[PDB]
């Protein structure tokens, strides 16, 4: 299945406005800059869906994941602390598409790939 018109926004700053085509080997989006880009499978953690409108007549799919950081480290010392986090633990991902039929043609790859 692929998405007709919707915008890409990745972890808290939003960037991505083009087309999202799922493939089932993984995932591939067009940037509305001309320049395509894949990604190793959606980062589905907490993703909020509405496929019935009551509260918001709106389409949106936003999925938020929480990434930790570590392995190596220059700036800053290892630590059990963290009084001053410069950086957010958690980035929150947002793929909101345009289109009835796009979230509709979502909902049914994720709901698909959450039953498979």
């Known amino acids: 299945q692929q998405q007709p018109e919707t915008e890409a926004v990745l972890n808290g700053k939003g960037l991505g406005t083009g087309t999202l085509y799922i493939a089932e080997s993984r995932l591939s989006w ?10 190793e499978y959606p980062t589905i953690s907490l993703h909020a869906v509405s496929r019935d409108l009551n509260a918001y007549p709106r389409e949106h799919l936003y ?16 630590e ?17 598409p345009s289109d009835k039929s796009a979230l509709e043609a979502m909902f049914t790859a994720m709901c698909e790939c959450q039953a498979l």
């Open 30 to 39: 067009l940037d509305g800059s001309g320049l395509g880009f894949s990604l």
């Open 63 to 78: 999925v938020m994941v929480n990434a930790k950081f570590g392995e190596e480290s220059k700036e800053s010392v290892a």
């Open 80 to 96: 059990e602390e963290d009084s001053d986090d410069d950086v957010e633990p958690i980035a929150e991902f947002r793929f909101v």
